[PDB]
Amino acid sequence: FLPFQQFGRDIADTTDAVRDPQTLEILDITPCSFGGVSVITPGTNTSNQ
Amino acid sequence: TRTQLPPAYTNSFTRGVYYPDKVFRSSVLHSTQDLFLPFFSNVTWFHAI
Ligand SMILES: *[C@@H]1O[C@H](CO)[C@@H](O[C@@H]2O[C@H](CO)[C@@H](O)[C@H](O)[C@H]2NC(C)=O)[C@H](O)[C@H]1NC(C)=O
Numbered sequence: 873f874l875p876f877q878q879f880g881r882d883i884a885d886t887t888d889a890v891r892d893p894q895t896l897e898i899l900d901i902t903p904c905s906f907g908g909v910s911v912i913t914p915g916t917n918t919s920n921q
Numbered sequence: 922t923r924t925q926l927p928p929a930y931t932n933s934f935t936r937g938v939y940y941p942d943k944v945f946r947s948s949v950l951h952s953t954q955d956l957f958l959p960f961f962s963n964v965t966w967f968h969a970i
Pocket residue numbers: 928930931963964
């Protein structure tokens with residue numbers, strides 16, 4: 873960061889950095905891994921596993 | 922003891938570019954609209970000699 877600005881932005885239009893208002897440090901925000909859930913089955917009739 | 926002379930003029934070459942905000946970006950394009958200095962304009966000239 874240059875010494876006159878307090879944020880960092882992306883194409884996504886959300887903040888991704890921030891200068892901590894105490895330590896003058898630069899912190900990167902990484903979102904948590906939402907992912908997706910799928911399930912495999914061989915059918916009800918044959919088994920339940 | 923001031924000699925008066927006709928005003929003089931010259932041309933601008935891509936001047937008047939300033940960071941319109943206080944936010945960081947990088948390696949990316951961006952369109953902005955603000956009060957700027959249009960390119961290749963005709964500016965007024967002053968000496969002191
Ligand atoms: C820059 O601006 C000045 C001021 O308008 C221009 O000077 C005028 O130019 C026209 C066209 O030749 C003349 O009819 C006027 O009499 C001029 N006015 C004065 C006060 O000199 C000038 O032409 C513009 N462009 C440049 C390159 O200087």
